[PDB]
């Protein structure tokens, strides 16, 4: 008899919805090591001549990691939380559905921590969280 706190992770998103969710999530992947180097060098070149600081509107990005996502949920800063269904030490995320529901942030459970890892250029990710999003994707995020 599996307790509901552990059984809830068997209810994952359907293949159709998980496809729209990951297709949207592909637009907000964290920048890789290579394109961070390219961005940082461009800032050094631009700072040298001649704009200066130039924050240039740090773009929205997908926040990843159970500790990062938990704080965002506790601060009501996350707009959407995606939880992998197969976290092998299943204590890292058992509180997250209840915590997300308590704080009012919508949450879904998706198939595969490996798919979340490819979103963040890593092997595995427990959870990813959607913070503020670009205007052209506000309609898409609302439907999800």
């Amino acid at each position: 008899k599996v307790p509901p706190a552990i059984n809830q992770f068997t209810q994952a998103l359907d293949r159709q919805t998980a496809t729209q969710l990951l297709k949207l999530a592909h637009k907000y992947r964290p920048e890789t090591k290579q394109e961070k180097k390219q961005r940082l060098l461009a800032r050094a070149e631009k700072k040298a001549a001649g704009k200066g600081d130039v924050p240039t509107k740090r773009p929205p990005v997908l926040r990843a990691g159970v500790n990062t996502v938990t704080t965002l949920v506790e601060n009501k800063k996350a707009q959407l939380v995606v939880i992998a269904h197969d976290v092998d030490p299943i204590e890292l995320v058992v509180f997250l559905p209840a915590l997300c529901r308590k704080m009012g942030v919508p949450y879904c459970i998706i198939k595969g921590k490996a798919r979340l890892g490819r979103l963040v250029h890593r092997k595995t990710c427990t959870t990813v969280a959607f913070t503020q999003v670009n205007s052209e994707d506000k309609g898409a995020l609302a439907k999800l």
Partner: protein
């Protein structure tokens, strides 16, 4: 004189002016914070109650409070710890009573 400092009596001791100050930060240990209370309430509704805690609630439901305290003290171990645990178990019973009232 009429009265002298004494080594004995209710007011015994050498007389010094007490230096009042803020207590040390280690004395703050054990205080419940707003965030830690929130976390513990989260885990409680995720987890539930231990089987002995549920049994003690059945005793408190039928108002066998002395028997409930005997049971809790036998489980937890000491009278002081049992009294605190019985108050909390009584509080959750009262909380779910008024929740079901509305």
């Amino acid at each position: 004189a009429l009265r002298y400092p004494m080594a004995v009596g209710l007011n015994k001791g050498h007389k010094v002016t007490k230096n009042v100050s803020k207590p040390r930060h280690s004395r703050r240990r054990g205080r419940l914070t707003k965030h830690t209370k929130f976390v513990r309430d989260m885990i409680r509704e995720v987890c539930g109650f231990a089987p002995y805690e549920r049994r003690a609630m059945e005793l408190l439901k039928v108002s066998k409070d002395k028997r409930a305290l005997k049971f809790i003290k036998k489980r937890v171990g000491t009278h002081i710890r049992a009294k605190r645990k019985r108050e909390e178990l009584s509080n959750v019973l009262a909380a779910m009573r008024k929740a079901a009232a509305k």
